[PDB]
């Protein structure tokens, strides 16, 4: 309504049309995902869709801070502080929407012991070690993730560590449906997803599920 929506595929537009469910991806330490914006996207999700979920950064976000020169303890402290801050803003907006918070907000670290996430994560890690092209594509995303969180050095070793985050986040981008228990869903973000473009152009041994999309939200 107040957002221009772009699509990764034609199938994403078909899913979007149906308005069954959306995943609002909120990012840590980024300038965009501020109290004002976070509210906007929730009000938008709420108004247009039957249901929505929020996906916040997982534990593996420490890795990104460690690569930006942070102590393993200092990184876990900054991660906890940010996620709690994000949770408090999100919970406030969900109440304003007269919706329950219970099972609405997730982290990509929450489904570590979920059989469906375990399967998808394994299949992705296998490709990361076998497929050389995919490994590179991941490291490019790791490099962008380090840049985007540049508020407060780089080597190929640094990028393999930062890739642990990418790998952990990925199962929600390919097939979130059996993990968060949805029929069909869209992962909504503010920028395009280069890895996804390549996934969609069958460049790897991984596939984004038919009941799964990716949309780009730009403020009107």
From Swiss-Prot:
The answer on whether this UniProt entry bears the keyword Metal-binding reads no
Tell me one GO molecular function of this protein: aminoacyltransferase activity
Q: Where is this site: Could be involved in aa-tRNA binding?
A: 78, 88, 165
Secreted as a keyword of this entry, yes or no, is no
Q: Give the family, as the similarity comment puts it.
A: Belongs to the CDPS family.
Q: Name one Pfam family in it.
A: CDPS
Record-given protein name: Cyclo(L-leucyl-L-leucyl) synthase
Q: What does the function comment of this entry state?
A: It uses activated amino acids in the form of aminoacyl-tRNAs (aa-tRNAs) as substrates to catalyze the ATP-independent formation of cyclodipeptides which are intermediates in diketopiperazine (DKP) biosynthetic pathways. Catalyzes the formation of cyclo(L-Leu-L-Leu) (cLL) from L-leucyl-tRNA(Leu). Can incorporate various nonpolar residues, such as L-phenylalanine, L-leucine and L-methionine, into cyclodipeptides.
Top EC class for this record: transferase
Q: Which reaction does it catalyse?
A: 2 L-leucyl-tRNA(Leu) = cyclo(L-leucyl-L-leucyl) + 2 tRNA(Leu) + 2 H(+)
Q: Which positions in this protein are listed as binding substrate?
A: 165-169, 189, 194-195
Q: Which UniProt keywords apply?
A: Plasmid, Transferase
Site Could have a critical role in the catalytic mechanism: give positions: 169
Top-level division of the source organism's lineage: Bacteria
EC numbers, comma separated: 2.3.2.22
Q: What is the species listed in this Swiss-Prot or TrEMBL entry? A: Staphylococcus haemolyticus (strain JCSC1435)
Enzyme active site: 27 (nucleophile)
């Amino acid at each position: 309504q107040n957002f221009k929506v772009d699509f990764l595929t034609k199938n994403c537009k078909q899913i979007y049309q149906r308005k069954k469910h959306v995943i609002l991806g909120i990012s840590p330490f980024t300038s965009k995902y501020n109290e004002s914006y976070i509210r906007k996207i929730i009000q938008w999700a709420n108004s247009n869709f039957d249901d929505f979920s929020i996906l916040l950064a997982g534990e593996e976000s420490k890795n990104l801070l460690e690569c930006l020169g942070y102590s393993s303890s200092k990184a876990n402290q900054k991660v906890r502080k940010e996620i709690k801050r994000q949770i408090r803003f999100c919970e406030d907006e969900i109440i304003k929407c007269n919706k329950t918070i219970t099972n609405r907000i997730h982290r990509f670290s929450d489904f570590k012991n979920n059989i469906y996430y375990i399967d998808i994560y394994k299949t992705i890690v296998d490709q990361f070690n076998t497929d050389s092209n995919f490994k590179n594509s991941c490291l490019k995303m790791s490099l962008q993730a380090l840049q985007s969180k540049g508020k407060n050095e780089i080597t190929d070793e640094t990028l393999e560590y930062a890739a642990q985050y990418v790998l952990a986040e990925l199962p929600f981008f390919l097939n979130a449906n059996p993990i968060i228990n949805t029929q069909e869903t869209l992962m909504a973000y503010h920028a395009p997803w280069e890895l996804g473009t390549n996934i969609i152009n069958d460049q790897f041994n991984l596939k984004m599920n038919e009941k799964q999309g990716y949309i780009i939200l730009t403020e009107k």
